[PDB]
Amino acid sequence: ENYYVKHVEFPQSATIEQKVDMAARLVPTPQQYAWQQMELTAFLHFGINTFTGREWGDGKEDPALFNPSELDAEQWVRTLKEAGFKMVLLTAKHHDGFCLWPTATTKHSVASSPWKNGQGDVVKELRAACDKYDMKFGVYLSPWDRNAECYGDSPRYNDFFIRQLTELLTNYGEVHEVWFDGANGEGPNGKKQVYDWDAFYQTIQRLQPKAVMAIMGDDVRWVGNEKGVGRETEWNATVLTPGIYARSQENNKRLGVFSKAEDLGSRKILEKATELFWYPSEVDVSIRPGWFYHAEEDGKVKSLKHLSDIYFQSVGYNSVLLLNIPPDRRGLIHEADIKRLKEFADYRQQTFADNRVKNGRKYWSTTSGGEAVYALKSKSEINLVMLQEDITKGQRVEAFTVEALTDNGWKEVGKGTTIGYKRMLRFPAVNANKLRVRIDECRLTAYVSQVAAYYAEPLQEETTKEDWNNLPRSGWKQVAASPLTIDLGKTVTLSSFTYAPSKAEVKPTMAFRYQFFVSMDGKSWKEVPASGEFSNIMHNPLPQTVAFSQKVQARFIKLEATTPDATVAKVNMNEIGVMVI
Structure with a gap:
């Protein structure tokens, strides 16, 4: 060789x-x-x-x-x-x-x-x-x-x-x-x-x-x-x-x-x-x-x-x-x-603290279609698998599949192409007691030098910071999708609401003509006076803050809107902001 x-x-x-x-x-x-x-x-x-x-x-x-x-x-x-x-x-x-x-x-x-x-x-x-x-x-x-x-x-x-x-x-x-x-x-x-x-x-x-x-x-x-x-x-x-x-x-x-x-x-x-x-x-x-x-x-x-x-x-x-x-x-x-x-x-x-694979460095030589099973540690829950090839002998793996043995049989947890030095696959957490890797395709004989598996804590994206919303939406709950109706989570006093089309991009479904309403109980709705037009929004989709004439007390808010075509608008809760005093 x-x-x-x-x-x-x-x-x-x-x-x-x-x-x-x-x-x-x-x-x-x-x-x-x-x-x-x-x-x-x-x-x-x-x-x-x-x-x-x-x-x-x-x-x-x-x-x-x-x-x-x-x-x-x-x-x-x-x-x-x-x-x-x-x-x-x-x-x-x-x-x-x-x-x-x-x-x-x-x-x-x-x-x-x-x-x-x-x-x-x-x-x-x-x-x-x-x-x-x-x-x-x-x-x-x-x-x-x-x-x-x-x-x-x-x-x-x-x-x-x-x-x-x-x-x-x-x-x-x-x-x-x-x-x-x-x-x-x-x-x-x-x-x-x-x-x-x-x-x-x-x-x-x-x-x-x-x-x-x-x-x-x-x-x-x-x-x-x-x-x-x-x-x-x-x-x-x-x-x-x-x-x-x-x-x-x-x-x-x-x-x-x-x-x-x-x-x-x-x-x-x-x-x-x-x-x-x-x-x-x-x-x-x-x-x-x-x-x-x-x-x-x-x-x-x-x-x-x-x-x-x-x-x-x-x-x-x-x-x-x-x-x-x-x-x-x-x-x-x-x-x-x-x-x-x-x-x-x-x-x-x-x-990476706790590798759940036992005996994951059993060097594995295989051709296409070959499979290897790895035992996991007792009571393993995993959502991350790591594979390595012995690249001292070349890069050979072209397609592979990974399965995890649950209480109710094998479940496919990932598929990949190359491995190389290191390849990691993430998937929804499963409780399993074995892992199986199948090399579906490879050049000559593949040499897999390690398989490892872990539980990686899922991470949340950061909240976008917006100077036009000072009440975090984590406290809000959507009451109705159309007209968008929102429980803000406590009683506040508002100086404005803002409509911010998603990604600041124009779309046929955006709000143009609107009426904004407030309620303490989510049943009795009072209109908040406003121009009723997000003027020029269909040519400039940047956020529009509607400054209220008066301080507006509210627990629930509601936006009724039609689009530039006079159809019913679609508005997401993430496109609305408010300013609390």
Whole structure:
């Protein structure tokens, strides 16, 4: 049994059967395998953009603006260690070109900033904190540089880039990941850099034998979006050609593949492929809407439910999750982010504390149609199953089914396609005493190395914060759907009600003409005087607050409405707000 490390070329008139056989035996390097094991890593977007409020800087920023008031990289790393992250990855230089360490290559760095009298080095402080907490360290060094005069004079910039890279990879200990962002906004006009990606790779390999080269790299593949969503069917043995190879643009176009594409490795797409790459997916997403810190987003840190969903759709979908948490203008991770990271870590810890499968590491070799049964611990209730393949021998599983043995027989609890490094399936809780896994389809013989099962507490979405409703709807009860009639849950005095079409979107069924009524007992209804028209709502579906002439006492409210077409409107309780005095 032989394996192809990282790349395999199919012989010129290989049959699909031969391609499948070779594909099944394509395997990660030790560095790629070690990377995969991390699972959960942290991005730190920090730089001059933190101080200007921009997501992308333009290269004209004054270094004087870089001035963190109380920077503490130990606070960053302690927070992230405690939250479960296995590496921290710093934006040493973003597209704006401002360097966070005193590089010999340019004046456009912390050396030209007032921070610590020009004597600072953020990269150094982060490395010292990683040293203290035994945290792995990675660097983001933007290929696109909007400050450097030599950008787009290709050989000069390539040398410049290598000199920056060499500093980062020489003076700051071991580096486990080097991130080369593909983003470039020069556009059809402006500067045209031809990067020497191979020389950059040779530098990395010489200085940092453990490192993987990511994104514009052939070690780690961008998942294809920034929203935190991987693929249910995730082939890390992939036809997608790393962008750093000169042949990539033509070969990817010929196969109809690109980073965001749906299918990057099915047998169907193998048909026109002439080679295959071990090039595994990394899901990058921010804890906030933006990558850099904005105070405006302090109330927009992603909810626990959303972060959990991201986890299940990343780590649970055979990707590594790289979650960004941006330090602020103090040079600290903000309190809101800290609290939410702790919540997320506590949720994962609770969820994975008690594996209910006994003997789940019985290594299982099977071909298509094979089944394996696993006993559960006494009195198990489960709603989460985790599977792994032995990817040291390739990625092989193509379809599978999972069943749980109840008091009243086997119940199907999930179905999937790929497994890979790790695949998790969630389903409604069941009480069961065994689990059965069936490999419906696989390449060659599949090797399942673990099955595990858990009870994950179901999480509720966060309540949307609305400045036009100050009586939480958790206390309301719907009395009637049409006309929408609502018991607010106690007697209040109202200054207004608001009608907010769902998603602020126009629809044929929206309210236009209306009468609003109030009652103390839900039987005797008094009309509240109002214009009776949500004027222009069919061209502007943003919320409309109807300010009352008088303070209005109410226990129950009722909205009678017709649509722009004079039909009966449909209104949901979530589209109504009130302001209590």
